[PDB]
């Protein structure tokens, strides 16, 4: 009925199309168990959201780098910020780990006991941490626009858009890493080199991707 | 139910009515050291003694150290006060420690006997008439008589809250002394000096910059 | 019924009740009742603020053609210090915004005058105070409300255009209008820049990166200059 | 949750403040007065701190105001914070001991009357001298009110007392803050701000020293 990752192949039993972006792609059966699939769903959503933020930041910084704005590349921004501003790298790492630890720990214990964070033990906030579904934490803090509490069809469509954009951003980040390790320049520099000559500037002519070329 | 981890499975032994009667019950026992009720009672006594001892020690370290920063006092550092106090003293540290061990052993033995049998210290004809006052209240570790001269434990409405201010504060004091030791082996200065140095530049003076608390960085 | 797209089906959450309802909500940000109630006040405040700002910029340039509006906060000297002016503005704006916010969350609760117990605002809606705030109302209430929301939307887009034209050309609204009327085929944004797969040219930002205001070097950058076409 | 004046019109104030206490405006975002016994103690603490701060602000402002005019006396040019290192007829330690004993006596009497109202309304030396039977903690009356001013509108007078006390407490905190930042007497800061209020502000003064 619904389209799958491999046309003609029947979708697995653990993938019935209830989740967003369900194409029945699981040849290794890594998510056959329900709890394991739940954990992997939250992991994929977090991965896609982080990948989306990273892809947007990398694209914007490379845009500012191509134009005469002085923006450093994404593979040198850390050194530029730490050396330009008197910022201690271990101190920043510890602060980031503290904030991420608090947020991810609350999220983890909410995954173990759904709705437990809504008891009011954190400054009295209750409905802001009640949670809607697995990997979809609705509330006035995470969703102040209230898009998750109205027009169910639009919400499901946005869920499909979010999972697809997340997978695309993950592939984009992997492409950024491979492009930097193979060509040595930024993603927009590679795009300009390819647009200048697409027949001779690609992965088949970089001299690194195909060793027999 | 207040908990040390919202959503974590609270242990069954910490959910009993007797365990919840203790002050500062937050369901924190990942190692299960309080499963045995006798062990839980003994550890509750140990926690109370540690809380009071840590509070007195941290107070004796922090207040004279804060007065030394100002012109109120000239008390040396806590890690150097022993040598300075024993220099111009009337007895060596060995004789003083011997008298200390004797005097502390007597009262700790009496406290141990009362822990083994509550109210047993009130044996008639055993402490020159003072044995009657040596019997504590119904709760172990909360005696009356010579202790608590102001009698602030007679009002029950605040009693349950009073104990909450004794354990929690004590727990904080227990960590405070720990910091006092760690900082001593990390910066080489006193606690008040470490606090001032951190307040001078918090973004570059902490445990992630001394090179001792983070050797991989 | 007027709509933003003739012959189009308006969204289910828009039934043409609120003023200026033209069935335009592709993202569905107004589907929730509470969100729509808050956004209505936000849109009204934005409308009035933008109308006042556009009128101020126009009168400022017409009366004073030598003072740039973008530089209005820089080349204006007053005996009242900038810190004192900021403190006065912060306190007065904080007071009025607190009263408005309290009326939003709790209607009919701050309509009373604290100094004098005899003055009190009459019952009204949220976002439309009335009473002392509306001494003269010439015309129909609903008609004037629709006119207000339409003029506010136009003023909001006008202020955005003012900012962008002042950042791209460095001229005021009247100056930009005259320059555009002089050479319309070569002074539009399409004539100033174009993007192709082999080249990406954008007009330069006429606003300096830093402004020395009493030796502080206030940064004044062009809004998303890297994304400029 | 009533018609009494509030610190935020329309806000949902806590229900334990029913207006019985003087100066009740339902201001407790931290809910420190939830416990009835704690609130009963905090009322007396607020009243004592209020009257003490009132005496403090009066004793800080009156001598500096009198020194700026033709009135003269021994300690006039000395600041409020510099009065400790002044040459008196006795050392500060002796005065400290005397006031500690006197304050201990009166504070123990007040505490005894606080834990049990009317239990300390009798003069220990002269049995005939006494306070009226109707009394509440924090409001002694009797010889403490020789002019009978409390016989009138006691509610409005109590409201005036608590409001003036809160204002004086804030003023004393401001005195401490101004002394620690500006390092000058309060009336001097007042005159400095009165000469040109646009450039003499806390933001400007703190930004100049940054």
Do the domain assignments include residue D190?
Answer: yes
**Residue B13 among known ligand-binding residues:** no
Which residue, chain included where needed, has tokens 């369901």? B27
Please give the residue range of the domain that contains residue D183. Answer: 36-209
Do the domain assignments include residue D3?
Answer: no
Q: Let me know: does A48 contact A159? Beta carbons within 8 Å.
A: no
- Alpha helix locations (H) across chain A? 34-66, 77-84, 89-112, 152-182, 187-196
Nearest residue to D115 (alpha-carbon basis) of D137, D142, D131: D137
Q: Which residues of C touch D (CB under 8 A)?
A: 79-81, 83-87, 102, 105-106, 109-110, 112
Do the domain assignments include residue D8?
Answer: no
Q: Assign residue B129 a region: left if phi > 0, alpha if psi is -120 to 50, beta otherwise?
A: left
CB contact under 8 A, B204 and A89: no
**Residue A83 among known ligand-binding residues:** no
Tokens encoding D24: 């009740």
Shortest Cα distance, chain B CAs vs residue A82, angstroms: 12
Q: Kindly write down the DSSP assignment for every residue of chain C, as one continuous string.
A: ---SSTTPPPPTT--S-STT-----SS-TT-SHHHHHHHHHHHHHHHHHHHHHHHHHHHHHHH-TTS-STTTTTS---SS-HHHHHHHHHHHHHHHHHHHHHHHHSTTSS-B-SS-TT-BPPS--SS---GGG-S---S-HHHHHHHHHHHHHHHHHHHHHHHHHHHHT---HHHHHHHHHHSTTTSSHHHH-EEETTEEE-----S-SEE-SSSS-EE---TTGGG--
Tokens encoding C26: 């592709």
Interface test with B, best of D37, D93, D112, D115 (most B CBs within 10 A): D37
Do the domain assignments include residue D162?
Answer: yes
Q: What is the resolution of this structure in A?
A: 17.1
As a whole number of angstroms, the distance between CA A28 and CA B145 comes to 73
The full set of domain ranges for chain B reads 12-200
CB contact under 8 A, D198 and C102: no
**Residue A25 among known ligand-binding residues:** yes
Torsion of CA B130, B136, B141, B147, to 10 degrees: -50
Of A87, A89, A109, the CB nearest to B5: A109
As a whole number of angstroms, the distance between CA C121 and CA C134 comes to 11
CB contact under 8 A, C31 and A66: no
- Please provide residue B71's backbone torsions phi and psi, each rounded to the nearest 5 degrees: -95, 15
Shortest Cα distance, chain A CAs vs residue C138, angstroms: 36
Do the domain assignments include residue D11?
Answer: no
Interface test with A, best of B1, B2, B6 (most A CBs within 10 A): B6
- Chain A and chain B share a number of CB contacts under 8 A equal to 40
Do the domain assignments include residue D10?
Answer: no
Angle of helix B37-69 relative to helix B156-184, nearest 10 degrees, comes to 70
A104 and chain B in contact, CB less than 8 A: no
A82 and chain B in contact, CB less than 8 A: no
Count structural domains, chain D.
1
- The CATH number of residue D62's host domain is 1.10.3460.10
CB contact under 8 A, B217 and A109: no
As a whole number of angstroms, the distance between CA C27 and CA C116 comes to 46
Contacts of C81 in chain D (CB under 8 A): 198-199, 201, 204
Nearest residue to A131 (alpha-carbon basis) of A154, A109, A98, A101: A109
Q: B touches C (3+ CB pairs < 8 Å)? A: no
> What structural domains and CATH numbers belong to chain A?
34-196 (1.10.3460.10)
Instruction: Tell the CATH superfamily of the B12-200 domain.
Output: Chlorophyll a/b binding protein domain (1.10.3460.10)
Angle of helix D154-181 relative to helix D36-67, nearest 10 degrees, comes to 60
Q: C touches D (3+ CB pairs < 8 Å)? A: yes
């Amino acid at each position: 009925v619904r389209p799958v990752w491999f046309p003609g192949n029947p979708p697995p039993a653990h993938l019935d199309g209830s989740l967003a972006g369900d194409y029945g792609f699981d040849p290794l059966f890594l998510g056959q168990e329900p709890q394991t699939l739940k954990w992997y769903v939250q992991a994929e959503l977090v991965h896609g959201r982080f990948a989306m933020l990273g892809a947007a930041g990398i694209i914007l910084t490379s845009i500012g780098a191509k134009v005469g704005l002085g923006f450093p590349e994404w593979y040198d921004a850390g050194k530029v910020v730490v050396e330009k501003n008197n910022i201690d790298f271990p101190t920043l790492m510890v602060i980031q780990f503290y904030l991420m630890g608090w947020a991810e720990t609350k999220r983890w214990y909410d995954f173990k006991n759904p709705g437990s964070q809504a008891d009011g033990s954190f400054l009295g906030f209750t409905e802001e941490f009640k949670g809607l579904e697995n990997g979809y934490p609705g509330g006035r803090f995470f969703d102040p626009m209230g898009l998750s509490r109205g027009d169910a069809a639009k919400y499901q469509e946005y869920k499909q858009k979010e999972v697809k954009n997340g997978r695309l951003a993950m592939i984009a980040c992997l492409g950024f890493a491979a492009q930097y390790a193979a060509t040595g320049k930024g993603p927009l520099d590679n795009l300009a080199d390819h647009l200048a000559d697409p027949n001779h500037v690609n992965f088949a002519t970089n001299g690194v991707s195909i060793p027999i070329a | 139910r207040q908990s040390w981890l919202p959503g974590s499975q609270i242990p069954a032994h910490l959910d009993t009515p007797a365990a919840q009667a203790l002050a500062g019950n937050f369901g924190f026992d990942p190692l299960g050291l309080g499963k045995d009720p006798v062990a839980l009672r003994w550890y509750q006594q140990a926690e109370l003694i540690h809380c009071r001892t840590a509070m007195a020690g941290v107070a004796g370290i922090l207040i004279p150290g804060l007065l030394t920063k100002a012109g109120a006092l000239n008390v040396p550092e806590w890690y150097d006060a022993g040598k300075v106090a024993i220099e111009n003293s009337f007895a060596p540290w060995g004789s003083l420690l011997a008298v200390q061990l004797f005097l502390c052993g007597f009262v700790e033995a009496k406290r141990w006997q009362d822990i083994r049998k509550p109210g047993s210290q009130g044996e008639p004809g055993s402490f020159l008439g003072f044995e009657a006052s040596l019997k504590g209240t119904s709760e172990l570790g909360y005696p009356g008589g010579p202790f608590d001269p102001l009698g602030l434990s007679k009002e029950a409405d605040k009693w349950a809250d009073w104990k909450l201010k004794e354990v929690k504060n004590g727990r904080l004091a227990m960590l405070a002394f720990l910091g006092f030791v760690a900082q001593k082996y990390a910066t080489g200065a006193g606690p008040v000096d470490n606090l001032a140095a951190h307040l001078k530049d918090p973004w570059h003076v902490n445990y992630a910059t001394n090179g001792v608390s983070l050797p991989f960085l | 019924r007027p709509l933003w797209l003739p012959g189009s089906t308006p969204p289910a959450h828009l039934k043409g009740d609120l003023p200026g309802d033209f069935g335009f909500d592709p993202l569905g940000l107004g589907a929730n009742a509470e969100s729509l109630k808050w956004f209505k006040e936000s849109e009204l405040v934005h409308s009035r603020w933008a109308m006042a700002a556009v009128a101020g910029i126009l009168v400022q340039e017409i009366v004073r053609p030598d003072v740039f509006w973008y530089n209005a906060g820089k080349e204006v000297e007053s005996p009242l210090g900038p810190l004192g002016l900021l403190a006065v503005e912060f306190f007065l704006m904080h007071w009025v915004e607190v009263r408005r916010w309290q009326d939003l969350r709790k209607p009919g609760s701050v309509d009373q005058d604290p100094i004098f117990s005899q003055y009190k605002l009459p019952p009204h809606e949220v976002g439309y105070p009335g009473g002392v705030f509306a001494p003269f109302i010439p015309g129909d209430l609903a008609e004037l409300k629709v006119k207000e929301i339409k003029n506010g939307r136009l003023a909001m887009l006008a202020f955005v255009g003012f900012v962008m034209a002042a950042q791209v050309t460095g001229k005021g609204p009247i100056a930009a209008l005259q320059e555009h009327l002089a050479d319309p085929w070569g002074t539009t944004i399409f004539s100033k820049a174009a993007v192709v797969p082999g080249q990406a040219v954008a007009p330069p930002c006429k606003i300096p990166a830093s402004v020395s205001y009493k030796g502080i070097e206030i940064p004044t950058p062009c809004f998303l200059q890297g994304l400029w076409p | 949750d009533a018609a009494l004046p509030s610190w935020m019109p329309g806000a949902d104030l806590p229900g334990y403040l029913n207006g019985t206490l003087p100066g009740d405006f339902g201001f407790d975002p931290l809910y420190l007065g939830q416990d009835p016994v704690k609130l009963k103690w905090y009322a007396q603490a607020e009243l004592m701190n209020a009257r003490f701060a009132m005496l403090a602000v009066a004793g800080i402002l009156v001598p500096e105001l009198l020194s700026n005019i033709g009135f003269s006396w021994p300690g006039a040019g000395v600041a409020w914070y510099d009065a400790g290192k002044f040459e008196y007829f006795a050392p500060a330690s002796s005065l400290f001991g005397v006031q500690m004993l006197l304050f201990a006596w009166v504070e123990i009497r007040r505490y005894q009357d606080f834990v049990k109202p009317g239990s300390a309304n009798q003069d220990p030396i002269f049995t005939n001298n006494k306070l009226p039977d109707g009394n509440e903690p924090g409001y002694p009356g009797g010889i403490f009110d020789p002019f009978g001013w409390s016989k009138g509108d006691i509610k409005s007078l109590k409201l005036k007392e608590i409001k003036n006390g809160r204002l004086a407490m804030l003023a004393f905190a401001g005195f401490i803050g101004q002394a620690y930042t500006t390092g000058t007497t309060p009336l001097k800061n007042l005159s400095t701000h009165l000469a040109d209020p646009w450039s003499t502000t806390v933001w400007q003064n703190d930004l100049a020293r940054l």
